[PDB]
Amino acid sequence: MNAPDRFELFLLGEGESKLKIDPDTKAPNAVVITFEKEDHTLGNLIRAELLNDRKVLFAAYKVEHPFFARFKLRIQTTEGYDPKDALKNACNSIINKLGALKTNFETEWNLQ
Amino acid sequence: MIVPVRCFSCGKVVGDKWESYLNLLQEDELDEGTALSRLGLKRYCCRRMILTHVDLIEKFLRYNP
Amino acid sequence: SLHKMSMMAHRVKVIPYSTFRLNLSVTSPYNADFDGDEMNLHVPQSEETRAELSQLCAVPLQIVSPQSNKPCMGIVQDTLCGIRKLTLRDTFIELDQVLNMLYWVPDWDGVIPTPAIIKPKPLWSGKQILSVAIPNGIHLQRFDEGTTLLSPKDNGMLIIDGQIIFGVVEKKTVGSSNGGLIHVVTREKGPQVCAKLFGNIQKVVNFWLLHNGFSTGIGDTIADGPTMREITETIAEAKKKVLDVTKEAQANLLTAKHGMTLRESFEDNVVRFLNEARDKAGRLAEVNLKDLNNVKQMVMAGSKGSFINIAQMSACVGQQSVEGKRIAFGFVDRTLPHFSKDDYSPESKGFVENSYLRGLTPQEFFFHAMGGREGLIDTAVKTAETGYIQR
Amino acid sequence: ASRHGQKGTIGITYRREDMPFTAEGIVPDLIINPHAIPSRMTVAHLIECLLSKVAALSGNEGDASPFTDITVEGISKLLREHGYQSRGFEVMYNGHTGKKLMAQIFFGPTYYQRLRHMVDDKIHARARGPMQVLTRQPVEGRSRDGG
Amino acid sequence: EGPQVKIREASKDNVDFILSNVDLAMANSLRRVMIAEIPTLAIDSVEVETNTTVLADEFIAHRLGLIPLQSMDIEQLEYSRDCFCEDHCDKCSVVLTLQAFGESESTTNVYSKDLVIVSNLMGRNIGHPIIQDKEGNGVLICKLRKGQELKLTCVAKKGIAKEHAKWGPAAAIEFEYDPWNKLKHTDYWYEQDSAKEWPQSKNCEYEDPPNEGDPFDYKAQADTFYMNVESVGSIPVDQVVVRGIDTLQKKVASILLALTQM
Amino acid sequence: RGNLMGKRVDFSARTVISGDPNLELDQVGVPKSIAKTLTYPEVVTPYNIDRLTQLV
Amino acid sequence: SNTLFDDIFQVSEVDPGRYNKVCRIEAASTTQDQCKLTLDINVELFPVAAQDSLTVTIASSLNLATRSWRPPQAGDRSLADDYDYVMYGTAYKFEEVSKDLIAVYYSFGGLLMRLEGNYRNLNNLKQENAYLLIRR
Amino acid sequence: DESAPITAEDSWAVISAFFREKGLVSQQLD
Amino acid sequence: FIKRDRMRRNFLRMR
Amino acid sequence: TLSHLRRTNTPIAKPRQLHNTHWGLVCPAETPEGQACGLVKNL
Amino acid sequence: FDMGGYFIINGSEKVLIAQERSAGNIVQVFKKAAPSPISHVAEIRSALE
Amino acid sequence: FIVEDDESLGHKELKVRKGHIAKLMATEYQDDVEEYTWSSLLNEGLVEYIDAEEEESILIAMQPEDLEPAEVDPAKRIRVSHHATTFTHCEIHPSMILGVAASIIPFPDHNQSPRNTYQSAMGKQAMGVFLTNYNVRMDTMANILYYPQKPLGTTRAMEYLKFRELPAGQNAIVAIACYSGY
Ligand SMILES: [Mg+2]
Ligand SMILES: [Zn+2]
Ligand SMILES: [Zn+2]
C-alpha cells in the first residue's frame, strides 16, 4: 500500500534539480555533489575515472539508503584545480571511451 | 497454474516452451534431463520452471461455467 | 515489556512502506528478532512529556543497565561476525575501497590516514581504518592467557588515543561485555557520543562486509575422514567401557557409592562416560575444523552458536534424556518394541550416536523427539510461571 | 517460511542489477542470513538446497524420505558430475561494483511457503477513535479501529 | 587505445564476446544498464470486455504484461508522460486487442500470436508479438473449454526495467573475469586442495595458466571480461549491446549537461 | 486490572518491526501512513507560525 | 627527515602461523650480538626466505596526523626509492629489560615489531610515528 | 523369482495398496 | 538419489 | 486440512510428554506449541 | 481431491476432534505418596459396552 | 509385516514375497482380475494389525533386508545388529511413524526436533491451492497462490498427500549470504 511509485526511481521529482553541489567545510578544496534519481550504475562509473586522474586526491560516493535513489559524491583535488572541472573531465573521458566501444563493437559485429 | 511466462530469476521466456515440452515427453519418451536440454533451457533457474511446474488449469476447466 | 529497557524513547525518521525500521543494536534489549514481531509506538501529546522522553528514557541513556551494571546494547549478528574478519592481520584494503569506507563514517574529519604499507603498493590494514570509527582519546587494554606485548595469537586488545594497536575485536571487546569498548566510551565521552559510535562502527563493517562476502554451507559441517574414523573409535571405546560396567554390575561385583543405590551408581557412571565421550568427540571436530570454516568463524567471533553445536553437527548428538534420566521404559522392560527385554545398552536407552549430518536411525530419531518435547513443555511452563513471579 | 522451520519476513527488495550474481548469470531470488543455520542446527535446510540443485540440473526429482541410504557424499558426487562445485558453494560477484566476493556463497534452489501473516493485515495507527460504551475508553481491535 | 571487443559466439538469442582494455567499473556499469535501463515496449494496461475464463482477470492482465513485443523501433515512440494527449494515442502507445472464443469440444488454447494490432503504426516496426517457437505459436496466455469467452483490449506503452521488470530486454547476462585466480580477488574454500575441487572454468582456456613458480604481481588490474548476453527477443541481441551502451552514454551526457547549466 | 492500572489507549501505532543498518542507534523509521494518521498538537507562537501556516 | 636507526639483519626463523599473508620473522643483527628483531611482514608483497640478510632502517620521516596522506603523483622524490618494503607505525611500548638492553615495540597498523639492543643504540626512538624500511 | 525375499524399496508398493483401500481420512468414515 | 516415477515405463516394458 | 481431519484431542503421569507407547501410533513431530502442547495429538 | 470426512451444518464445515478417554474395565493400582492413610488405591472404572 | 520362521530355507523371513508385490502393482498400473489389494494382503495373513497392547508381547525389526538376514562406507549412519533371532513382526516402513504435517518436511532425521515441531505448526497456515473447485464456492478468506510448484526435494509420502497435485509453495533460488546487512 505505502510502496512509493516505481517511477520515482528514475523520473525527476517536482522542481528537484538533477545535481546539488555543496562545498564541504572539513577539508579544503573539497566538495560534495548529490545526484538525484541515480544509483551505482552511474555512481561507481565516475569514481573509477576520478581515481585515474593524477590531480584528484579523494573521490568516493555513497547511496545513503536503498529506498531512495540518490547518492552523494565527494571529490577533493590539489589546490588551483576546480573539483567541478575534474568531474567534467571524468565525464568527457567516459563518453569518449563508450563511443569508442560502440564503434569497435559494431565493427566486430559486422564480421559475423 | 498454466505455465509461468518468463522466469522467476533469469527472465528468459519459459511460456511457449511448455507445449513442446509435453510433446517431447509424451511422443519421444525422452527423460526430462534430455527434454529441457533439447528445449534449450541451459541454466537451472529456467529448468525449475518447467520441471517443478504443476498445471492445474486442466483440472479447473472441467467445471461447467 | 519486562525491562525498563523494554520501553525507550526514539527519534522518528519517516520512511516509506510498512514496517517500523530500527537499527539492530537495539534488538537485544527488546528481546526482539525480526520475524512477525510487532512493536507498539506511543506519541506523547504534550511539550512537557515530549521533553521528558528525550531527557530520561532515550536510547543513548539506556546503554548501560542497572541490572548487570554493564552494556545491554552492543554489536550483534552479521556486523559482529564481519568486524572480526576486518581486524585480522591477513586483511588489507586497497586505496579505492579505503576511500569509500572512510566516507561512510559520517563524522570523519577529511584526513586520510597514512597507509600501513607503502612501496610496494599502498595498503591499509583493517584495524587502521576501523580506528577511524573510534573516537579519539580512548585507551583500553585487555590481556588473556597467551597474551603478550607481541601477542602472537592476537589475543587480548589494546587501543591508544583511539588507535587499535593489536587484538581482534570480538564479543569480549565490542560486545555487551563488562569492560567492553562501549562500556568505556560511554563513561569517557558521554552517552550521547557512545550512541553515535554504533552508527559509525556498523556503517563501516557492514559496508566492507557486503564487498567481502560471507556465507555458510554444508561443507562447513563435514569433517575430514581421518577425523571421522577417530570420532568413531572414540565413541566405540566409550561404549566398550559402558559394556564392562554392565557386566560388572550384572555379576554383582560393583559396589555403589554410599548414599546411592546400586542402580543409581550404575546409571550415574554410564551417563558420566557417555557425556565424556560426546565432549571428547566434539573437541576432535573442533580441532579438525580449519580456520576458513565459516561456522568456526561465527563461533570464534561469538555471534551465534557455540561449541556444542559443532559437536552435534559434525560429531555426535549424544545422550537424549527425559527428566534428567536416560529414556525410561514405556513398554515393560524395554524402551521400544525393537529391543529384547532388560537391555540397558546405551543404544537401547537412548544414546544417539550419529551426528545430524549423517542422520539418525529411527529408534534414535524417536528418542530425540522425546527430548525435544520435554524441552518445549518445560519451556512453556517456566515462561508462564516466571511471568507470574515478575508480577 | 521453509519446510524446515525457518521463518522470516522480507527485509528489503532489490532488483536484478543490484543483487549478487553467479558467473553463469543466475541471480538469487532470495537471500537469507548465515547466522540462521548454526544456532538452529537445521542441516536439512542445507541438504535440501544441495539435493534440489542436483534435481534441478539432472531433471530428476529427489527423494528426501526420512530414513534411507541417501548420503551427503553421494549427492556431492552427483553434483560434481554436472561441473559445479561439489558442496554447493558458488563464486558470486557483487552487484554494485561487479567484483568477485572474496567468499563464495552457498547457492541453490529451495522450496518456500508464503504465510497467512501479511503486514497490510497488521499495521494500524489510532489517534482519537471511538470509545466503548461502557468504560468510554478506546475500543478494542483493528477492524473496529481500536487503540 | 580504448576498449576492444572480440565476439566469440553470435546467435539469434545470444551474443558472447570478450571485452577488453576496460576498468572493471565501466563493464559492470554496462551490464547493469543492459539489465535495467534499456527502453522497451510492453503492455502497460488492460481493459477486459468479457472474461468467462477460470483465470482471474488481473491474473490474465499480469501474463499479458510479461509477453515480449517487437521493440526494434521503440526509439521513436514517446513516453506516456511526454505526450501531451489525454491517456494515449498513436504517438505514445500501441493498441492491441484479443478475441478468443472456445470452439471445439476439446480444449482451445489462446496464444500470444492471437493478439492483433488495431492501432495505426505510422509504418514503424513495433508491437508485433514475437514468436521464437519453431512451431509458430508463442506464449500461452489462457485456455478455454467451450462457452468460455475472452475479449479484451491491451494498451502497450514504452518503459524500462527499473520501472517494472516486464520491460527488461535482457535475459541472464553472464559476467566473468580472471578465470584463473591470478588477481586473488577470491580465496577458495576447500577441504584438502582447492585446485582439484573447484571446477575449471571454461573461459580459462582463453587465458594463460597461473604459472605456479611465480611471485604475485600486485600491480595488475582487472580487464579481459567475458560477457554472454541473452535477449528475451524483444530486441535483437546486437542491438541489446549497442543500445545499452548508447543509453549509458546519454546518461553520462545528462550529467555533463547538468554541470554545464550551472 | 483491565480498566484502571492499565488500559487501551489512543495515539498509538502497531506494525511489524524490521531492521535497517543505515539508521542511527536511537531513531526509528515510521511509515508514511502511520505518520499521516498520528498527530502531535503543537502550539502556535512567533517562531513556528510560518512553518505551521505552511502545514495548514 | 633523517634516519633514526639502521642495520643489516639476518633471518633466523620464519613463522607462517595460521596466516596466509603475514609471517613472523625472527632475525638477529649482523653486527651487535645483543640486537634482535621480531617483525611481522606481508609475504605476498615482499617474500622472505630464512637466513636472508635484510637491510633495515627506520627514518622517522621520508622527507629529504594533521597531514592528509596523498597518492604519490609521479617524478616525486619521496626517498623510499632505495628500500623495497616500507611500513608506517608507532611505538606503543618502551620496555627496559636489563643493563644496556632496551626493547621498543612498533605497531604498524596491527603488524607487530619488537626491536631490542644496546641502550647506546635506539636512544633516537621516542614515541613518534616511525617508518620502517627494508630492502633485499 | 516369486518366492524371493523383498527389498526395502519394494515396501512402498504395499503402502500404496494400503491408501488405495483406506484413504487418508477413512477412520472417520468407517 | 532422486524419486523414480518412470515405473509406468518400467512396469509396461517388464509385464 | 488433512492434518486437521486426523487431529485427536486429549481432555485436560505427565500427559504432555511423548511416551514410548506412542511409537508408530502418534506423530512425535506434529504438536501445537502453547497451553495445549502435547494434549493435541496427530495420527 | 476433497477428502470428505466432515459435516456441513448451517453452511459451515464442522469436524469432530477425536475425543480421548481412559479405558474402562481395566484394573489399575496407584501409590498415594502423601500422609493420607491409604498406601495403595486400586481403581476400576466399570461401564457396559 | 508378519515374520515367520517356518520356511523351506533356514532362517526367518517375511511372508510377503515378490510374487505378491507384482500381483499388487498389476492392480495399480492397471487401474487383471479379482483386484488383489489390501484386503487380500490382510486375509492371506501377510500383514497384521497391532495395537499398543499387543505391542507388548512382540519384537519388531526396522528394515526387512537389513535386520532379517544373518551376516562399510563412512558416510552412512551407524546401525544396530540382527542378533535377535525371534523377530515376530517387521515394520512396513519406519517413515510411517510421521504424521501428515511432518511428512512434508524433507530429511526430518537431519533436523533438531523443535524445528520439526515449528514446521508442523507453520505448515498448516501456509498459502496454497486448497481445492480445485474454489472458483465455484463461497467462504470467508480464501487464499490461492498464482503459480504453485511441486518441490524438487520431495518425500515419497507426498505421493499420498496429493501434495504434488496441490503444492503449497514455490521453489526459489536462494543464497545464504551476509550481504547488505538488511
Ligand atoms: Mg520474533
Ligand atoms: Zn531461468
Ligand atoms: Zn499520446
Tab-separated table of N, CA, C and O in Angstrom, chain E residues 173-228:
chain	number	residue	atom	x	y	z
E	173	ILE	N	22.649	-12.367	-17.897
E	173	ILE	CA	23.880	-11.880	-18.501
E	173	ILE	C	25.049	-12.460	-17.729
E	173	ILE	O	25.263	-12.129	-16.557
E	174	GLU	N	25.827	-13.291	-18.403
E	174	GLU	CA	26.996	-13.932	-17.843
E	174	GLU	C	28.156	-12.956	-17.839
E	174	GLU	O	28.572	-12.470	-18.895
E	175	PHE	N	28.688	-12.683	-16.660
E	175	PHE	CA	29.767	-11.737	-16.463
E	175	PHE	C	30.893	-12.506	-15.806
E	175	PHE	O	30.643	-13.277	-14.879
E	176	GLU	N	32.113	-12.356	-16.302
E	176	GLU	CA	33.197	-13.081	-15.657
E	176	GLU	C	34.508	-12.396	-15.983
E	176	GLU	O	34.620	-11.719	-16.995
E	177	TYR	N	35.479	-12.529	-15.096
E	177	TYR	CA	36.794	-12.032	-15.449
E	177	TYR	C	37.829	-12.768	-14.625
E	177	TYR	O	37.540	-13.217	-13.520
E	178	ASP	N	39.033	-12.859	-15.168
E	178	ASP	CA	40.124	-13.507	-14.463
E	178	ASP	C	39.715	-14.936	-14.122
E	178	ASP	O	39.440	-15.234	-12.956
E	179	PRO	N	39.594	-15.820	-15.113
E	179	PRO	CA	39.160	-17.191	-14.806
E	179	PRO	C	40.108	-17.921	-13.887
E	179	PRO	O	39.663	-18.544	-12.914
E	180	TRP	N	41.401	-17.874	-14.158
E	180	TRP	CA	42.352	-18.230	-13.121
E	180	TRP	C	42.318	-17.137	-12.061
E	180	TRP	O	41.871	-16.028	-12.311
E	181	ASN	N	42.809	-17.448	-10.878
E	181	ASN	CA	42.608	-16.564	-9.741
E	181	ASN	C	43.669	-15.479	-9.641
E	181	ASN	O	43.772	-14.834	-8.594
E	182	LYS	N	44.455	-15.271	-10.697
E	182	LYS	CA	45.702	-14.513	-10.657
E	182	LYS	C	45.617	-13.236	-9.835
E	182	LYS	O	46.549	-12.915	-9.093
E	183	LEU	N	44.510	-12.508	-9.935
E	183	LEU	CA	44.371	-11.269	-9.182
E	183	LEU	C	44.090	-11.485	-7.702
E	183	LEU	O	44.182	-10.528	-6.934
E	184	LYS	N	43.731	-12.699	-7.295
E	184	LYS	CA	43.447	-13.033	-5.900
E	184	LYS	C	42.275	-12.243	-5.326
E	184	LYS	O	42.211	-12.040	-4.115
E	185	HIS	N	41.334	-11.791	-6.154
E	185	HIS	CA	40.124	-11.195	-5.598
E	185	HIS	C	39.300	-12.192	-4.807
E	185	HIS	O	38.387	-11.779	-4.089
E	186	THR	N	39.593	-13.477	-4.914
E	186	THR	CA	38.806	-14.501	-4.252
E	186	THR	C	39.729	-15.550	-3.671
E	186	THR	O	40.570	-16.099	-4.387
E	187	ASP	N	39.577	-15.834	-2.385
E	187	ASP	CA	40.199	-17.009	-1.806
E	187	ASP	C	39.207	-18.160	-1.817
E	187	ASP	O	38.008	-17.974	-1.619
E	188	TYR	N	39.721	-19.360	-2.051
E	188	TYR	CA	38.897	-20.532	-2.274
E	188	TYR	C	38.710	-21.339	-1.006
E	188	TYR	O	39.684	-21.787	-0.398
E	189	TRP	N	37.457	-21.510	-0.611
E	189	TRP	CA	37.113	-22.519	0.364
E	189	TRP	C	37.433	-23.891	-0.202
E	189	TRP	O	37.190	-24.159	-1.379
E	190	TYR	N	37.973	-24.767	0.637
E	190	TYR	CA	38.275	-26.118	0.200
E	190	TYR	C	38.293	-27.049	1.404
E	190	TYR	O	38.189	-26.615	2.553
E	191	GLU	N	38.472	-28.334	1.117
E	191	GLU	CA	38.595	-29.374	2.123
E	191	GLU	C	40.035	-29.842	2.260
E	191	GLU	O	40.626	-29.725	3.334
E	192	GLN	N	40.619	-30.387	1.191
E	192	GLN	CA	42.043	-30.685	1.153
E	192	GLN	C	42.778	-29.766	0.187
E	192	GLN	O	43.617	-28.971	0.612
E	193	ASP	N	42.497	-29.860	-1.108
E	193	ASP	CA	43.090	-28.982	-2.101
E	193	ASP	C	42.005	-28.209	-2.842
E	193	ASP	O	40.947	-28.762	-3.156
E	194	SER	N	42.281	-26.937	-3.129
E	194	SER	CA	41.330	-26.110	-3.862
E	194	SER	C	41.371	-26.376	-5.363
E	194	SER	O	40.330	-26.340	-6.026
E	195	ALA	N	42.554	-26.642	-5.907
E	195	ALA	CA	42.688	-26.818	-7.349
E	195	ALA	C	41.866	-28.001	-7.839
E	195	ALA	O	41.131	-27.892	-8.822
E	196	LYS	N	41.998	-29.150	-7.174
E	196	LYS	CA	41.243	-30.321	-7.598
E	196	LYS	C	39.748	-30.064	-7.512
E	196	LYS	O	39.013	-30.286	-8.477
E	197	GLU	N	39.279	-29.591	-6.357
E	197	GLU	CA	37.843	-29.494	-6.120
E	197	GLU	C	37.191	-28.458	-7.018
E	197	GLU	O	36.232	-28.758	-7.736
E	198	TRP	N	37.676	-27.225	-6.983
E	198	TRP	CA	36.999	-26.159	-7.703
E	198	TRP	C	37.045	-26.406	-9.208
E	198	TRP	O	38.133	-26.537	-9.774
E	199	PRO	N	35.898	-26.461	-9.875
E	199	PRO	CA	35.876	-26.761	-11.307
E	199	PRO	C	36.732	-25.803	-12.105
E	199	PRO	O	36.901	-24.638	-11.750
E	200	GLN	N	37.268	-26.308	-13.203
E	200	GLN	CA	37.999	-25.479	-14.146
E	200	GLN	C	36.984	-24.731	-14.993
E	200	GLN	O	36.182	-25.352	-15.693
E	201	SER	N	37.003	-23.402	-14.936
E	201	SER	CA	36.048	-22.637	-15.717
E	201	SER	C	36.388	-22.711	-17.198
E	201	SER	O	37.557	-22.707	-17.588
E	202	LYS	N	35.352	-22.732	-18.036
E	202	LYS	CA	35.598	-22.868	-19.467
E	202	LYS	C	36.438	-21.715	-19.983
E	202	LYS	O	37.403	-21.923	-20.733
E	203	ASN	N	36.141	-20.496	-19.544
E	203	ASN	CA	36.855	-19.381	-20.122
E	203	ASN	C	38.333	-19.439	-19.795
E	203	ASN	O	39.114	-18.700	-20.408
E	204	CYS	N	38.736	-20.327	-18.886
E	204	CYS	CA	40.145	-20.431	-18.542
E	204	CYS	C	40.961	-20.680	-19.796
E	204	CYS	O	42.103	-20.223	-19.902
E	205	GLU	N	40.341	-21.312	-20.797
E	205	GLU	CA	41.095	-21.716	-21.976
E	205	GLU	C	41.659	-20.518	-22.710
E	205	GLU	O	42.679	-20.637	-23.394
E	206	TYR	N	41.015	-19.371	-22.592
E	206	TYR	CA	41.447	-18.215	-23.361
E	206	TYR	C	42.472	-17.373	-22.622
E	206	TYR	O	42.884	-16.335	-23.144
E	207	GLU	N	42.909	-17.794	-21.440
E	207	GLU	CA	43.993	-17.117	-20.747
E	207	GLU	C	45.071	-18.117	-20.366
E	207	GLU	O	44.891	-19.333	-20.458
E	208	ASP	N	46.199	-17.583	-19.952
E	208	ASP	CA	47.367	-18.393	-19.663
E	208	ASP	C	47.209	-19.110	-18.327
E	208	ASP	O	46.488	-18.635	-17.447
E	209	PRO	N	47.860	-20.251	-18.158
E	209	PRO	CA	47.862	-20.916	-16.856
E	209	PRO	C	48.520	-20.034	-15.810
E	209	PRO	O	49.233	-19.085	-16.153
E	210	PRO	N	48.291	-20.309	-14.523
E	210	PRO	CA	48.794	-19.394	-13.485
E	210	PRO	C	50.305	-19.380	-13.356
E	210	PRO	O	50.844	-18.411	-12.806
E	211	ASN	N	51.002	-20.419	-13.820
E	211	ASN	CA	52.464	-20.499	-13.749
E	211	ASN	C	52.940	-20.461	-12.292
E	211	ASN	O	53.464	-19.460	-11.790
E	212	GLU	N	52.735	-21.604	-11.630
E	212	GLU	CA	52.860	-21.729	-10.182
E	212	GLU	C	54.182	-21.214	-9.619
E	212	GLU	O	54.240	-20.860	-8.439
E	213	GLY	N	55.237	-21.169	-10.421
E	213	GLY	CA	56.546	-20.807	-9.917
E	213	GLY	C	56.776	-19.325	-9.728
E	213	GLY	O	57.923	-18.888	-9.578
E	214	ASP	N	55.706	-18.529	-9.711
E	214	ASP	CA	55.906	-17.097	-9.862
E	214	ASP	C	55.580	-16.343	-8.582
E	214	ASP	O	54.757	-16.792	-7.775
E	215	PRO	N	56.215	-15.197	-8.367
E	215	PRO	CA	55.765	-14.289	-7.316
E	215	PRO	C	54.530	-13.525	-7.761
E	215	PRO	O	54.282	-13.329	-8.953
E	216	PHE	N	53.753	-13.084	-6.776
E	216	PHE	CA	52.458	-12.476	-7.038
E	216	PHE	C	52.611	-11.062	-7.573
E	216	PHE	O	53.195	-10.204	-6.907
E	217	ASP	N	52.057	-10.803	-8.754
E	217	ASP	CA	52.025	-9.445	-9.284
E	217	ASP	C	50.908	-8.684	-8.596
E	217	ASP	O	49.730	-9.036	-8.729
E	218	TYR	N	51.273	-7.631	-7.879
E	218	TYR	CA	50.317	-6.786	-7.188
E	218	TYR	C	49.869	-5.586	-8.010
E	218	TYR	O	48.923	-4.903	-7.608
E	219	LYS	N	50.508	-5.310	-9.140
E	219	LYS	CA	50.141	-4.135	-9.925
E	219	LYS	C	48.915	-4.371	-10.788
E	219	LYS	O	48.163	-3.427	-11.051
E	220	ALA	N	48.703	-5.599	-11.251
E	220	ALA	CA	47.731	-5.844	-12.304
E	220	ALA	C	46.323	-5.452	-11.870
E	220	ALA	O	45.960	-5.526	-10.694
E	221	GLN	N	45.525	-5.035	-12.847
E	221	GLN	CA	44.134	-4.676	-12.637
E	221	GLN	C	43.249	-5.534	-13.521
E	221	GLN	O	43.696	-6.122	-14.505
E	222	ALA	N	41.976	-5.580	-13.167
E	222	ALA	CA	41.030	-6.425	-13.874
E	222	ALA	C	40.733	-5.835	-15.239
E	222	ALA	O	40.309	-4.680	-15.348
E	223	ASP	N	40.976	-6.620	-16.279
E	223	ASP	CA	40.408	-6.404	-17.599
E	223	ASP	C	40.211	-7.781	-18.219
E	223	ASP	O	40.315	-8.802	-17.538
E	224	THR	N	39.926	-7.814	-19.519
E	224	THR	CA	39.638	-9.061	-20.218
E	224	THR	C	38.428	-9.743	-19.572
E	224	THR	O	38.520	-10.732	-18.849
E	225	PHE	N	37.288	-9.126	-19.832
E	225	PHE	CA	35.991	-9.513	-19.303
E	225	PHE	C	35.291	-10.429	-20.288
E	225	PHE	O	35.389	-10.246	-21.501
E	226	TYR	N	34.587	-11.408	-19.758
E	226	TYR	CA	33.871	-12.414	-20.530
E	226	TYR	C	32.389	-12.157	-20.332
E	226	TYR	O	31.857	-12.381	-19.244
E	227	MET	N	31.714	-11.712	-21.384
E	227	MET	CA	30.298	-11.399	-21.300
E	227	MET	C	29.517	-12.250	-22.271
E	227	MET	O	29.830	-12.290	-23.459
E	228	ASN	N	28.502	-12.928	-21.762
E	228	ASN	CA	27.489	-13.567	-22.579
E	228	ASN	C	26.159	-12.900	-22.301
E	228	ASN	O	25.793	-12.713	-21.146
